[PDB]
Structures are given as structure tokens and as C-alpha cells.
Paper text:
Three-dimensional-image reconstruction of a total of 93,393 individual AMDV capsids resulted in a resolution of 2.37 Å, based on an FSC threshold of 0.143. The reconstructed capsid of AMDV, the first determined structure of the genus Amdoparvovirus, also displayed familiar surface features with channels at the icosahedral five-fold axes, protrusions near the three-fold axes, and depressions at the two-fold axes and surrounding the five-fold axes. Unlike PARV4, the three-fold protrusions were separated and radiated further outwards (the maximum capsid diameter of AMDV being ~300 Å compared to ~270 Å for PARV4). The amino acids, including their side chains in the VP monomers, were generally very well-ordered to the C-terminal tyrosine 647, with the exception of the apexes of the loops at the three-fold protrusion, involving aa 93–94 and 238–239, which showed only weak density at a sigma (σ) threshold of ~1, preventing reliable placement of the amino acid side chains. However, due to the cleavage of the AMDV VPs at D420, no density was observed for aa 420 to 449, but both ends of VR-VII, leucine 419 and proline 450, were visible at the capsid surface. However, in contrast to PARV4, the elongated VR-I and VR-III (15 and 18 aa longer, respectively) are responsible for the three-fold protrusions in AMDV. The region at the three-fold symmetry axis between the protrusions is primarily formed by VR-VIII, while VR-V is not surface-exposed. The VR-VIII loop possesses an additional α-helix B. In fact, three helices from three symmetry-related VPs are positioned around the three-fold symmetry axis, creating a small pore with a diameter of ~3.5 Å. In fact, AMDV has the longest loop for VR-I, VR-III, VR-IV, and VR-VII among natural Parvovirinae isolates for which structures have been determined.
Aleutian mink disease virus (AMDV), a pathogen in minks, and human parvovirus 4 (PARV4), infecting humans, are parvoviruses belonging to the genera Amdoparvovirus and Tetraparvovirus, respectively. Despite low amino acid sequence identities (10–30%) both viruses share the icosahedral nature of parvovirus capsids, with 60 viral proteins (VPs) assembling the capsid via two-, three-, and five-fold symmetry VP-related interactions, but display major structural variabilities in the surface loops when the capsid structures are superposed onto other parvoviruses. The viral capsids are critical components of the viral infectious life cycle: they protect the viral genome, are the determinants of the tissue type and host that is targeted (tropism), and remain intact while the virus escapes the endo-/lysosomal pathway and trafficks to the nucleus where the genome is released, leading to viral genome replication. The VP monomers of PARV4 and AMDV conserve the β-barrel core motif (βB–βI) with the additional βA strand and the α-helix A (αA) observed in other parvoviruses.
Residue numbers in the entry:
A (entry chain G), B (entry chain A), C (entry chain F): 42 to 419, 450 to 647
Amino acid sequence: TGGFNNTTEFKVINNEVYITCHATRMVHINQADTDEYLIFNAGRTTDTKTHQQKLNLEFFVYDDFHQQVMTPWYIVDSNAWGVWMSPKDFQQMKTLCSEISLVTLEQEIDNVTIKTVTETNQGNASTKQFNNDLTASLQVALDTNNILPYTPAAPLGETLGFVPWRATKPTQYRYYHPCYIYNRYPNIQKVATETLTWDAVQDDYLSVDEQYFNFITIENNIPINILRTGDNFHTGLYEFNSKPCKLTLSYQSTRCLGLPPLCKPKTDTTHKVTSKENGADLIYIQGQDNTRLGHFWGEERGKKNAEMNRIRPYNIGYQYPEWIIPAGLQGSYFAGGPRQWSDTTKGAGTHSQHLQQNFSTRYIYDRNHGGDNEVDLLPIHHSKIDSWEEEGWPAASGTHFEDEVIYLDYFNFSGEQELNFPHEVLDDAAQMKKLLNSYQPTVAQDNVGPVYPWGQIWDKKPHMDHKPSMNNNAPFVCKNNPPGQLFVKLTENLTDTFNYDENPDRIKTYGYFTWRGKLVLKGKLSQVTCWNPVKRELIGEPGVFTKDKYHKQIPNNKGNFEIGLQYGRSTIKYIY
Amino acid sequence: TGGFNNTTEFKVINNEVYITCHATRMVHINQADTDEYLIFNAGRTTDTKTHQQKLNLEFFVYDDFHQQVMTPWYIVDSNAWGVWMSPKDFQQMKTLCSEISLVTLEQEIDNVTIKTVTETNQGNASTKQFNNDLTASLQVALDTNNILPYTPAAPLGETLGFVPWRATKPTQYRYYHPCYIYNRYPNIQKVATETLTWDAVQDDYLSVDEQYFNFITIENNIPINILRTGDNFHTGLYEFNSKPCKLTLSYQSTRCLGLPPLCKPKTDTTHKVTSKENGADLIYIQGQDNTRLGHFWGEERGKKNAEMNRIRPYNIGYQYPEWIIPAGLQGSYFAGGPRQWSDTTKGAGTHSQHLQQNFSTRYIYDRNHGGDNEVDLLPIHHSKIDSWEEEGWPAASGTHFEDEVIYLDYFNFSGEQELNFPHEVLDDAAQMKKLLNSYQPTVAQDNVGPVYPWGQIWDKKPHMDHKPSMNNNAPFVCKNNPPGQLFVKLTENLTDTFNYDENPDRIKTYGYFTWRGKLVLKGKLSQVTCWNPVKRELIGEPGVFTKDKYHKQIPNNKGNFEIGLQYGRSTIKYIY
Amino acid sequence: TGGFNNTTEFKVINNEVYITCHATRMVHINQADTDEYLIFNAGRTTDTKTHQQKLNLEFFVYDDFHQQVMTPWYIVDSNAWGVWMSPKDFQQMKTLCSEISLVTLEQEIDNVTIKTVTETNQGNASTKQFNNDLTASLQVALDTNNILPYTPAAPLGETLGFVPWRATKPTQYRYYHPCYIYNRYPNIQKVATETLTWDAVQDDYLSVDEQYFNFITIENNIPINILRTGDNFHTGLYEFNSKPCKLTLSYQSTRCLGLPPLCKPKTDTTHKVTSKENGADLIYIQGQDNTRLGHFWGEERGKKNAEMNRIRPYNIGYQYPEWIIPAGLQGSYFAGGPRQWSDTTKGAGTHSQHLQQNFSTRYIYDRNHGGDNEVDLLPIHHSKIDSWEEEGWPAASGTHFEDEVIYLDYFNFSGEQELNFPHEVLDDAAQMKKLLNSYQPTVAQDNVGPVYPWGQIWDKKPHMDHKPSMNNNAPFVCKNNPPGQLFVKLTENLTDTFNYDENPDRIKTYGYFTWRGKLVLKGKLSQVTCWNPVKRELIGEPGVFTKDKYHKQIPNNKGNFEIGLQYGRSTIKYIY
């Protein structure tokens, strides 16, 4: 119990499943470059001026500019799926459960081991001796009240590593210092056409306001614990309050809600639905084509209605303009959009990449977060980072094809004479692609579920009058405050000569400690009602045909392997 | 207790603060011009026709047209912040509390004093004698069930006065009679270009439908109390059910949510954040520029991502087109928009007024509601009314610069070759300024908080299927029905000769009474976590430099002074 | 609890506020140059003789001469405001409380970590190895009876540092050995005019008397505790007995005590008090100018009295000659004077610096006591020390303009004929500036309150027949003996070769330990009675206009920042 445990156990009692995840890591820690708190601006870029050419797009989307408070502390951040479960474990949960819910979280720290480094230069140096420092200390701070600004580490891909038998690193704690107004290319609309004079304007604009300085330290707000060799620290028992998350996906749109029309099967010939042929024809009124007994949108033009204007209870998904970037106080940002899953739209760039598949997402990760240490084929030697394309497949229900929207003004007509397109329908659809937000209160939207390994498990809600109902990063949002962030630091180890200036003179020191945590999940046995057997794995891009993906799922002779993406919502189910 | 009490007491018990506000006013009342209920149309305006010039904008935005039920009664309306607190008191609450909540409300009426006026003409008249009428009565009606349509008096700037030692007036009770359809400039789109014939169309359009007559009187619905000299009336104890309102503002946008990038401070040179220089530079992967390990929007173009497409949990604020007026049944109206706070956008009208600062607001008020009796420098002599510009400073978090929005269609590219703007980006942004609604379920919006003195404290929610989540006028919205409206009237005092026609022959009569009320507030001690001292006052426009504002905060030799604006949300805090 | 805690909590119970201040520091300690007690004279200076020029003033005011007992021990001195509170915390207390009082003090020492230094010379030396010495000891002595002479360390600006996350140093313990008589320029009045012969006299005079030797050691008087690694030391619970200190300042003088004259406001014209015009005129008796019904000083000259000779209950402040230095046994010293706050006296050096603002004070401090590490703009490179000018603003009530005093001999006259100045009034005022002490039993004087960060919190009263009622350094004076001084020392760590001579042969040794303390304050909720909102910040010299002060309140990219001055008494209130 006082030692390494990384295991999962599945237990079913009341027809509820209980998932207990044990995780343990060896955490290697170094001392920060200073013991000071630091506050600085970083990322302001001056483009290379072309007033005779044109303004630079690359300069526009690559701003990293921000202002930052950098602290001597480090976060131990366990919030990602890859920390708590192996690939088998996540498949197990994915198969057993129809839905899951967070129950409770525990974590502790012990096995503090600190050493000092001595370097004597003999034979042109390159000699290091390592000695235990038995009185050296590790400082631990738990913020249970969430005083400090909340910084989940999964979106930057730096958390505890995903492999239980490798050592891992904490990340240094830092947070934004939103005291400023920043904008890049101000007055974009004051350049006349193209290069009439200069097409580079002012570059950026910046103003900092001392009014807004908010500078928060750990030492003032939180009590700090000091741990030597035999010491240990326990966070306590945290309880999640949050709603359950379904593990099923639906492939269903507005056209599929409710009763289908009544049809008469074709008796003469035989068809399968994959043959893409009519196997039946509709039964209309008195044999009169297009005449149905419904509830429909519009006015009667002669009483011809179809499956298209049949009134539906709800709208599934909504049309939203793709890649709009608004400008906030502190910079311009991608607004994103409703997650959708598209594939195989014939046109545009033809068959190569098709479209972005609506609002597409990439994960980019290193060796310890599930990358094979080699970049996948199609100055450093090659590259050590891997990436994955997360296309939103569980969200397929509400996907919309942005090119295909049609606008009609008068749909009905006072007579049955004819129905023709206006000659502006083509142009009017192009405008409607980029400018149309179809969201309304009849819309039902479905987010992507848990994403493995790299997805964030839980997140904090913002403190605001109008609260958002959805979250891009995480399937679980805490109603109350989230689990407290866990900060760790090496005690300053000083030489005999005290420095009165900024940076202290220190003995070179490092250590490692054991992080151990327990995460408890509650779920419900999956009940699948279909006759046919179910396929729970997204296919079309495995290593089965010449993609060599699944070959890389186990270690090689060097010990390198990579972890594949898995969606928590893998099972088909009817909504409505 | 049976007498004048206007005081506030702050009391802290459980680490909760209790704020008890006592308010008392002398209320001068007159008898209405008739004892009848009146129903009329008012405000229809015929413009001066230019068919040879152009249609008049001034005629368009200045419609006051409405239909109205005017009643003999008067409202005693205490719902504004300036009624219950002094400028010191509101600063006190603003400093002590992190949030506040409404607890309970009591109010009563006594000290009824009624007089009659006799005028004898001697020496060309101008002589008035005043006599007590000891049997005269004041009628009081409390609508506890909210039968009558709800008409908060703060938006028209007429409530009980804000100064405790001045006498004040009630306002006469009236309400809209929505039986009609009204529109001004119908068929605006049927004029061809400019003045091809006549550019003034039909002016307005009006239709009244007897179907919709709803005419409600106090006498049928509510029991009425009669008060003579020694009598007194008590409303009882009302209990608010509503959510708390935070007293903190955030200056934070989407770019500032979560972990900042890891950076390395510059060791050679020294900078302060106000110097607007880089104090550090980012650490990229393998020194390869723009390469980060993230979670990002889009497809990999060669794996260059930045702080701009970094996926964020939420969107803070949203882009909404500014100054759109839709046309409802009973007229066209300004839709408003999400409250924002802008300043210092270089461009457009240059430095003078900059923009509207997004959705700007004005208060316009008289001497008793906190105006100095003189209009501020830059047919009546001068003007006695003052105004204040409420620019939405507590809402700064979600402000957007409408000119700066960018639209990209294909952000990703199948190769790393180049990224260039399309030549339509400039035009396509102009369209997107006026037509784009970026609202979606990931948006978090923050309203302006309590506004002092002129802001409304509480308000009623509409009885509707889809209820609104935000309110422009008031920080507190009652889940159940709001406090009952308090109606007051002088009993008809008739001469000896009874009139059988419309308006009664009355003895000229007036009186005054004492209104007294108690408002209880609950709050939580403010906990500020920053190192630096906090600045709780909005500056940049005080009387400190040559604005002579704070000089006017205390009475002059005439007793005139004016009350300055104060935001309830004055303290900076991190959301998320 | 056995670890780092630096936090403050504000708690309100009985309508009393309780302020608990937690403070913790890492204290770096070195071994003193000797283990001996040392007694020496220091500071005697021989001026460069000009008998042909004139005696040197610089030589006069720069004497540091003293006799001193220097001890091997070190003081841990927490007595300053900057130790116990952050800038936010002090503002909080300043805003919440009308007055404060000291309750109790606790402090302890643990986390003793001692190391030895070994230096091997290889590659021209410059190599240090650091080893734990696990049996080495720290000696701790608490003087609970105040046997040793009391030496508060704030006036020399050396106490524990003000920043909680920086390491800090103790100061070595030393005290005056008052056995001697010292005087500089004896017989200053025996030089005839200027340089009649030699204008440098005898320089100084000195005599030491063995009669008065008082030489006190820690080892004889106090029991000493020995602490190794796991050990800890607790002082116990100390209880303050002292009177409360108000947190309000008054701006009020003798002219403002009591009833003003009755006046009649001007009805024709309008004025504000900042316009500096009469808004009313006085009502005299029977319209007879200057005739009032009073209680006045003097004899009736014809019964014309004014607001100037109106008898007042008290005198607020008193006139005292500024910069007189008396000569005591052990040297000449500045006597100081009643604290006053002056500004804007037109004359003398005109507008540049005006006067000293009466008895002015400077603080001079280093980086760890709140200095930015750079000296403020307007052989070492530049200078690392900062200074602040403390001008006595809370004491403004009793300030006097020393140039403006008038002396009359016969004020009254046996007739109404005329009142004229004597021709000597001008000269007689000049004499009265330098020689006049106006103190008397009707005087009410008000000291400066708490001063942040650098002010001393508490102090000891002298053991004397006539005790002083005021203290220049500290707002709190203990009636009983003050908290005991806490002495700390490294145990002598000796080599194998024992030295029989004066200074011992030691292993080079240093350590650090944790100092932790808890200070409890009691206060009363501030009750402000004014209508207008209150301004609690001294302005006219912030960084708001081009002074860049508040910009420096948060760390830069190097971690340097400075702490601004704050007066405990920031709120205006009427005395009397």
C-alpha cells in the first residue's frame, strides 16, 4: 500500500459497474532557474515588411504573444485518460459500459529522494559524483479552494507520462496575466485593395494597464508541507459532482426522426440496402404523386409535400461558419464550432483530402505521451514527435455539409403551376456558407466523448453570469470547484555565501518522488438491443492494410511503441 | 420605529455579511386630472414629406408611438440602488463583499397629512389658504399576486428620490395596451434607389384589433385600504428567491484561458511588462519554429500551430452585429447586444470618440435622482438635466473588436508550401461585421453588475415557454413573482354639486405621507488573493485632472450636488 | 503545521475583527568571525584641520562614534510591519478597521540544516564541496526576562526580509556600552568670530570611566537550547498588554474646534468651496462689524472680537524649534519634534522643495526590505539602495508654520482708537521661530500611526521616574516588559588541533533554519459616517502621472519589485 500500485479492477454489483484505477509514477524533479516569481511578455513578433507585396498571413495566424506569470513551482497533473488506464483497460470500459460517471479521487506523494551533484574537473572534467542529501526537503502545496488560476496541462500535451514503467517529469507552473489589450494587424480594413501604398499597416497594437494587475503567489495563499525521506503526503478524499457521460454514439439526423413513410416492398426483384437501389416504393394518396397526410412546413401549393418539409421535433446539429476568428481583448482566436464528422464529399479538392471534415482537431505529442519516438513517414535528424487527427466521429449525427445549403424565399405558391429556382440561388448559397449561424432553441447538439489517451478527463466551469453548456476539451465539468491543483517544489539549497542580489547561489540539487493516485468510476452495463453483432472499432485507418499501425502497438527491440487513438463512444445507438 | 429612519448597518456573523438598509421618504402627492381610467393612442407623427429629397432618418428613430391605459393611481417605486444606499454605503458594500444576495423586503406607509386649498381673489388674487382636512383619506392598494402589468420605474428615471432629506414625488401609474400592430416606413424596400419618384412611402401603418382588448383596473382586482391621519399600512414580509450576484469583474479573454506556453526568460536584459517588450522567448520543439505539442484546431500542414488555434474550453463573449433594429408587432426596437467594454481602438474616427465602445448606454436624470441642477458644460435657460455614459466596464472580458474579424475557408493545406490571404479577405470581413452572430453553446457571457445610483435592483421574468437567461436592466431576477407593486391614491373629495358628466367637480386637495422600507442583503466577505494592493475605483475620468467631478460630490451654498456612477463589480478576479 | 505557513485570515465575530498573521522564513546563518565577546570603540574621526578657513559642519553631523559590545550571537527580529503582512493584507486591515490592538505572539524554530565546506585546490582551486554534518547543532536562547539591553532592528533596516519566498539573514547581536563621555567640538563658543586664529578647536573630547562597566553575556544569564536536525523550539504564548491605536487621521486644527459663527448664505450667486470665494457672510450684532457674543481672550477694546481670539478647549499641536541638537553624555543628537505634515508654503526656496515639511523622515532600505534592486533615477556601478520620504501626513492636524508666528504684547487697548503693529514684530517673529517652545498642558498631540512596510510594530518603555508619553519609532509600547529577544548561534565546530590563543581554529560551517511565527491582532469594524465616498490612498505622488511607481509594484522578468509606503491611518475622521 505504501508502494507502487498501477492496476485497474472492474467490479459489478447492483447492475452498476465500479472501475477503480490505480496509477503510480516516478517523478523526476529539477530545481527551477530562479526562486523568484517572474512576470514578462513573450511572443511579440515583427514581420518582415512588404508594403510593395502584400500583408502576411503566416504572420497573422502564428502569434504566440501573451503575458505570463512564471512561478518556481511545478504542477503534478494527472488529468488525462492515458494516465489512468492502459489501452486494454480503456477498451474494457468502452465495451462494458453504456455510460460512466466520476466518483472520487485520491492522490498522495512519498518516497522523496534528493541528491546533490558535485563536479570535479580532472582529465578535462566530465565527472559527476552523486550524494544523498538526507536533510533536503520537498515542498508540497495543495490548493483545495482553487485560489490560483486553473491550468489543465493536457491541452499542451504535458502531464504525467502514459507508460507506467517509465519515469516522468512535472511541468513548471505558470499562468496568464490578463492585464493588457493586444491586437495584430489593427485596422485591417484601412488598406485600399492591394498594395496601393503599403500593405503591412501597424503590425500589432499593445497596451498594458496597471489597473488590472492581479499577482498571486502560492506562499501567501496556501499552507505548505515539507517532506523529507520518510515523509508522505495525502490529499484526502475528493468527491466529484457531475453528470454522467454516455459511451454510445448515434449516426442519426433530422431526416431520420420519427415514423418513415409507409411503403410497399417490391415483390418481383431482390435487393440489399448496400446495392443502393429502391427495394420498395411509397404509397401515396389515391395514387396521386407526392400527396401525403402530414404535418408540414409552408402553405398548400396543391398539397404536394415530401420527407423534406415534414415537420420534425428537433434539429440535430446546426450550420455554423467554419474558421472564423474573432478578436478578443488579448488576441484573436479560433472560435471553433460544433463538432461534426464528415467524410467522402465528392468535389472541391476532389478525392485527396476532401474537406477539413468540418471542425477537425489534431493532437501532437512526444514519446512519453504515446508517441513512437519516430515521426511517421509521410537542423535535427528527422523528428521525434507524432500527431493524430481527431475528426469527431462520435458526433456524426449533427454534421452538416456547408456547401449544400439552399435558401428559398417563397416556398409555397398560390397555384400548382410550377416550381423553379430563382437565378440567385447559387450565389445566395455561397454567401450563406460563410455567414450563416443556424443555431436555435430547437437544436440538439452532441459533443465528442472521452478521447484516449490524450483527452482531458475533467475541467472547471467559468465563473460567469451566462454559463456555457458545452466544453471542447473535457467530457466532465464540475458543478462545484474541481479537484485542487497539486504543486511541488524543491526547497532552496544554498551555499555558504549568501547572495543579496536577484538569483540565489545554490548547490546543484535534484530528486525524484513517487506520485500515486486512485480514481474511481461508476458506470452502467451496456445493453445493446440489435440482432447483428456490433463493431466497436473505428476502421478505415488501422494498420490492417499496409498502414503498419497495429504493428507499432507493442514495444520493439529498443522498447519504443506508440498508443493508438480510441473513442469512448464507440457503440451505435438511436437517439430519439 | 413609527418615524423617520434612514440608516444602513453592516454586520458580520458566520463569515457572512448582513446588510440592512433603512430608507424613508416624505412623499408629496397630488390628485390626478381625472378619476377616470383613460385609454388613448399617443405619439403618431407625420413627417414632413420630401419625395424629391430622401426619406428621413430622424423621423425613423424618434417614434414614441404607443397605446396606453392611464390610471388615476400612483406607484411608489423603490426599486433602484440610489434609493436604499448612500454613496459611502455602496462603496462599503462594494469593498466588503465578494457577492451579494437579496434576502427580504418590508415597507409601510403612515403620517398621512391631507390639506385643501382655498383661493380668494383680493388685490388681483394670488392668495392661497391651506387648511387641514382631518377626515380626508388616502387609498392604498398592494398587488401581492402581480395581477397588474409590471412597470419598473427606474428605466424612466422616475422613482423615489435619491436624497433622504428632500421631499419626493410618486409617478402616475400607466401601462401599455398591446392590442395593435404598428410599423413605421412599411415597404422600405419598395423605394427604387434614391428619389426615383417619392422617397417617403406611406409613413406609418396602424391597425387596432378589438380581439385583444385587455383592460384591467385596480378596483376590481385588489382590496383597497383607507388611511386617515393616525392610520398606518404594512405590506408584510416579502422574501426574495434569487441567485447571488458576484461583485467582482474579470479582465480575461479566450486567449488567457489555461496554461501559457513554456518560456525562457531573457537573462541579459531587464524589462517591465509596461515597457511592451519581450522579456522571454518561447521554447519550441527541437528548436523548430512554431512546433508545439498541443491540442489544436485544423489539419496538420507541417505541424506549425500557435497560441491562436490552441483549443480552449470555452468562448468568452461573442460577436454580435451592432445596432440592428428588428420590427415587432408594436414597433421597431433596438435589440441591443452582449455588454462589452471597449476603449482605445486606433482608427475610424481616430482618437476623438473612437467607437461606441460596443453597446454603450446612457442614463439621463434630474436633480432629485442625482443630477446637479445644472447641465455639464460641453426657449429655456441652459438645461437642468444631467447624463452619464455607462460603457460596460465590468463586462470587459467578452468584448470583441468588430472590425478585426477574419474568415478563412481552408486553413490547413496539404503541404507546408505557403500560407497567403485570399484577395477577398478584406471584403469578406466587412460583410462579417454587420451580419455575423457568433453565439453558440460554448459561449460564456458576463453581464454588467449592479449600477449605482440609477440601476434597477430586481425585475420580473416573462411568462414564456423559452425563458431568457439574461436581463439588461437588473442584476436580480425573481424566480417566483416579484415584490408586489404599491399603489396610492387620494380619495375623491367632492363639492356640493354633483357632476353627471365625465370629470368630477372636486375640492382642490393635496397631501403628503411617509414611505418607509427595509431591505436586507446577504453577502460574503471578499477574499482577494493578490500580492499587490487593489484599486477598486474606475479611473481615467474622475475630477482629479481638470474634470471637476469630485468637487461636485458635496453640496454647494445652494445645496446642489450630484452623485457619481459606481459599479458594483469593481474588483478584479480570475474567471477560470 | 510543522511546515511553511505564511497566510493571513480576517475573521469578524462580535463586531470585532480578528487578524491572524502567519509568517515563515528560511534563515541563512553563518558563523561569526570569533567566538569571543568583543568590546571596542568605533567611529572617532579626526577632521582635516582648517584653522585659516573655518570649522567643518560635515565633520560635525557625521559622527558615528560609539562604544560597543559585539557578541557571537545573532538576533531573529520580526518586529516590523513588512514581516507579517503583504501589501494587500495591510490595505485590507487599513480599510476594515477603525483601530487595532496587539493580542498575542508565538514563534518557533525548526528544520535545522547544517553543512560543512571543503575546498580542494585543483585547476587553481575554485572548487567547493558541501557535506551534511548531522551531529552539528544550533544554539537557541530566548530572553524572557529582558535581561539584555533591548535593540529593535527595524530602525537600522535589518530584520527578517519582507518577501516570503526569498531567503533572509539574521543580524549579529550587539549593544552600546555606555561607560563614557563623548563630545565633538568642545567649547564651540571659544572661537572668536571667524578664523581669528584657528577655527578647529580640539576636535572631540573623550573620557572612559571603569566605574560604569556593565558587561553582560548570554551564557551567564539565559539557559540555552541545543537543536539538531529533527529538533524544534517553541517560545510559548506571549500576551501583549497595550492600548489600541486608531487607524484614522484627522485634518483639523484649533480654528476648527466647536461651533462656527452663524452665517447667512448668499442667495444671488452660486459658489463651490473649491472656488475659494465667500458663499455666505457673517451675522454680527446689530449689524455692527466684528461684534459677536463670545468667550474671548483679552480685554474689551470696544468689543471687537473674531474667530482668532475665540477661546478654544484645547491647542492642537504646538510650535517647537526645528533642528536643535542638544549634547548628551555620549554625543550630540537630533531631538526631533512633534510630527507634522506641511505642504505648499509659498516662499523661502519658492516652489522647488518648499520647507522640510517640518520634521521630515527618511527610510533607507535594501532589496530584501522592499527596495527594487536599482536606485531611482533622480566606485560601484549606480547604487542598489532605495529610500522613501515619510512626511507625517497622518499628523496634519497639529502642523504649524514656523515662519508665521506673531507676538503681541498689549493686545487690548483702553480705547477703540487704532490697532497697529509695533515696528519690532518682524524681528521678534524671527527670534520666536528658533527659540519658542509653545508646549503646555492644554496641548493635544497626535503621532504618526503604523507605517508600512518599514515601521516598527512594538517597543519597550524606558525604566525611568518620568516616563515619556510618546514614541517616535513605534505605535505600540508595552506597559510590562516586551516580547523576549530571540538569539541564535551555530555551535563551535572545532578542528583536531586545539588553539590556546584568542581565535579558535574551526571547520568552515554554515546552515539554515526555518523561523515561523504567529501574530494576532484585534480590531473594530470601521464606521465611516460621511455621505461622499472615501479616498483611503495618499495621492499626489503615485506612478499614475509619469512617476512609474505603481508599475514597479509587481516583479519584472528578473523577479525584482519594490514595495510602496502605506500609512495605517488613511481615513479622515473628526477629532472633537
